[PDB]
């Protein structure tokens, strides 16, 4: 019964916030008793971090992270393919930043972590907190991602190139 | 004052459980009033958010801001600095208010206040090809993004107030927008 509190969750999450999220409504919207839900989920932050996990672990695969590890490709390249990632997912799944975004507002090998930090201690990335390099190529996606889906302009308007340009200069050094 | 301490509290629910939480029942037991008391003074539910999303918002920029924003002789470099250096003071001496925007934005999902002051200028940098040919919700969405993170690291004990400069942070933002 994972994947159908799961999607209820999720649609909770778009339509009221995770500070909407809870067990009771979460059973109701459903449509089980409140203890079905206890046995996966033993309450509101373990629902939110459940549907958390679902669409974070959506955004790369195994071999991504995989791929992502490998310190013999520099961290520029390691970076630039990270964020086409984060873009190309995003583009294909409009309603999952907004989760994700949403939770992080309410708010494993540690590959990305990892990545980044490394480039800071490189001097390729500026000397700012992991979560302001995170920050801007979550919330740079994100708002473009939803400027798409309302029909501020087309998804052809612009390209990966001209939206990793921000992207890239806000981290970048220098 | 009334009205304020309804204000207050629609906020507190709003932090606690989303705007979906807001209702004047819940607004009313947390100042100890009658509902009745609270009718006087916004009409429903929505009455309430759309009080505390113009009191956050109108927080941001002041007049003399404003004015200063929308003057046409001065650079749009130096107009620009000004108006990110403003939301950034804003934001750490108001740690929960862009949270509060946010969260009331996110669940609504449809500018230089009233006039367009700060959208006209940054197209106005736009076409002048001082910052970069994106959609101004991009460049609003890059500074206030970065500036909502930043604040609620400091609440969460990463780092102090004191860590950063607005010179350190400001150097990511104006970076993403600038031309180049």
Redesign the interface.
């Known amino acids: 019964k994972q994947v159908k509190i799961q999607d209820a969750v999720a649609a909770i999450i778009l339509?009221?916030?995770?500070?909407?999220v809870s067990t009771t409504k979460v059973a109701k919207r459903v449509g089980i008793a409140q203890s079905n839900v206890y046995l996966y989920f033993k309450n509101k932050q373990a629902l939110i971090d459940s549907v958390y996990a679902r669409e974070t672990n959506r955004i790369l695969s195994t071999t991504d992270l995989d791929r992502l590890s490998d310190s013999t490709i520099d961290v520029t390249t390691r970076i630039r393919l990270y964020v086409q990632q984060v873009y190309d997912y995003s583009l294909a799944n409009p309603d999952s930043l907004?989760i994700i975004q949403?939770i992080k507002?309410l708010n494993p090998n540690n590959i990305v972590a990892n990545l980044l930090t490394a480039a800071i201690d490189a001097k390729v990335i500026?000397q700012?907190?992991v979560?302001?390099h995170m920050?801007?190529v979550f919330?740079?996606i994100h708002?473009?991602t939803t400027?798409i889906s309302?029909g501020?302009?087309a998804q052809d308007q612009?390209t990966f190139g001209?939206?990793f340009?921000?992207?890239w200069?806000?981290?970048?050094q220098?």
């Open positions: 339509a009221e916030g995770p500070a909407g907004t949403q507002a500026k700012l907190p979560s302001l920050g801007v919330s740079t708002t473009h400027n309302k501020r302009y612009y001209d939206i340009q921000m992207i200069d806000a981290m970048k220098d």
